[PDB]
Design a protein around this ligand. Structure first.
Ligand code: CA
Ligand code: CA
Ligand code: CA
Length: 435
């Protein structure tokens, strides 16, 4: 079975065809590409090794970021796993690995990595789900040169949750990408600046990760699965000395579905013993991490399994941190969007199985770094229909056809809005400058 993550559908990539993507080349500057992965092995992917990061096709351990990014761009269509923006093995992908498990390990600069993308990879699009706080004239000039030479540069705005500029995203020659969730709401962590240019799916993004390093969840009732609806295993964290460390609960639980009603700020769970506890999320991640509140409400009641669904404030699919100070949540708990939670209440009383599974080959990630590949992936796809147009023209098309979000007009949170592949393509169909 193959799933189409919400982001793929929202950007409109599923209705277009990448049959011509072979005339485009997108270079991913990141932590490598797990070429051994079933959903990535057979892509038209190449790479340029660097003395400091080993093989581009071997991310190593706990260095799956680049693989997740690559999966969003080109996870292969094959009835298993997921699908990326261009899943039919047409697009040319070049990999430049600048990150090792320990961190940046490239023998040279970011400018050098981009040079390699262009000179060695023949890249038309360079996607960078990375960022730093510093900026320089040499770098600004080098990237402006590549841009004017016809290379489209795209980067992540950052997840610091403030107005700071992250580079290269904040240079004028680069598209700064913001993150929004499945309800098109601005991601609380997404940095907001006057450089933010466009938005892409960046909360609860399912994609490929280094084989065996992922994690998934599922909800089954009447022999049917809610997996395709989006079920996120709780990113549980428990105390570990001077901080918190991941303490995932990977197990399965089965029992009659029962909901803990939320009245004001109080819970009416009753006796959840031997049952799967459905509960609406109280509060939302931002200045704090309240996931534990609704979650513990269920647990305290004796629930064997817990299903937390989004509230009306943030109805989209959330993948929040489950900060468990007392390490109380020792049962499998998951997160689903509001629509899914409301559909589940119709099944109350029925036998339900909730499960969190470790050692998987896919996983849900959050980040402007996840929104970025949606944008660069769509940019490459749309560009393949009109390779004659310049990078600046393609960039203009994406901006001119993005779906305005939040307050009317361009804003620092979402830029011009949610990228729209179909509209962008239609734009260039008229001419390289649109209608
Ligand atoms: Ca697949
Ligand atoms: Ca910029
Ligand atoms: Ca707006």
């Amino acid at each position: 079975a193959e799933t189409t993550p919400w982001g793929q559908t929202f950007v409109g990539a599923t209705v277009l065809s990448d049959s011509q993507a072979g005339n485009r080349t997108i270079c991913i500057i990141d932590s490598g590409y797990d070429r051994s992965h079933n959903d990535l092995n057979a892509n038209n992917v190449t790479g340029t090794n660097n003395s400091g990061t080993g093989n581009w096709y071997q991310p190593g351990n706990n260095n799956a970021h680049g693989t997740h990014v690559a999966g969003t761009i080109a996870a292969i269509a094959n009835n298993e796993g997921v699908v990326g923006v261009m899943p039919n093995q047409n697009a040319n992908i070049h990999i430049v690995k600048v990150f090792n498990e320990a961190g940046w390990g490239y023998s040279s600069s970011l400018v050098a990595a981009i040079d390699t993308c262009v000179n060695s990879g023949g890249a038309n699009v360079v996607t960078m789900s990375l960022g730093g706080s510093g900026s320089t004239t040499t770098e600004r000039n080098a990237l402006n040169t590549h841009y004017n030479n016809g290379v489209l540069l795209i980067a992540a705005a950052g997840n610091a949750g403030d107005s700071s500029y992250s580079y290269p995203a904040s240079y004028d020659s680069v598209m700064s990408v913001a993150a929004v969730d499945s309800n098109l709401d601005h991601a609380a962590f997404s940095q907001y600046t006057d450089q933010v240019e466009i938005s892409g799916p960046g909360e609860a993004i399912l994609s490929t990760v280094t084989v065996g390093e992922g994690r998934l969840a599922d909800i089954t009732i009447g022999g049917q699965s809610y997996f395709s609806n989006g079920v996120v295993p709780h990113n549980r964290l428990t105390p570990s000395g001077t901080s918190y460390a991941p303490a995932p609960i990977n197990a399965s639980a089965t029992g009659a579905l029962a909901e803990c009603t939320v009245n004001g700020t109080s819970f009416s769970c009753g006796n959840m013993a031997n049952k799967i506890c459905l509960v609406e999320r109280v509060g939302n991640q931002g200045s704090s991490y309240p996931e534990i509140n609704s979650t513990k409400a269920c647990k305290t009641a004796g629930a064997k399994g817990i299903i937390v669904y989004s509230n009306s404030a943030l109805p989209g699919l959330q993948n929040p941190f489950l900060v468990d100070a007392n390490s109380d949540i020792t049962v499998p708990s998951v997160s689903v969007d509001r629509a899914t939670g409301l559909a589940l209440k119709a099944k109350l009383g029925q036998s339900t199985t909730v499960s969190n599974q470790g050692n998987q080959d896919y996983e849900y990630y959050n980040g402007t770094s996840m929104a970025t590949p949606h944008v660069s992936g769509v940019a490459t796809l749309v560009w393949s229909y009109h390779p004659e147009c310049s990078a600046s023209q393609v960039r203009a098309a994406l901006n001119a056809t993005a779906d305005d979000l939040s307050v009317a007009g361009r804003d620092n949170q979402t830029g011009y809005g949610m990228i729209n592949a179909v509209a962008a393509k239609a734009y260039l169909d008229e001419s390289c400058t649109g209608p």
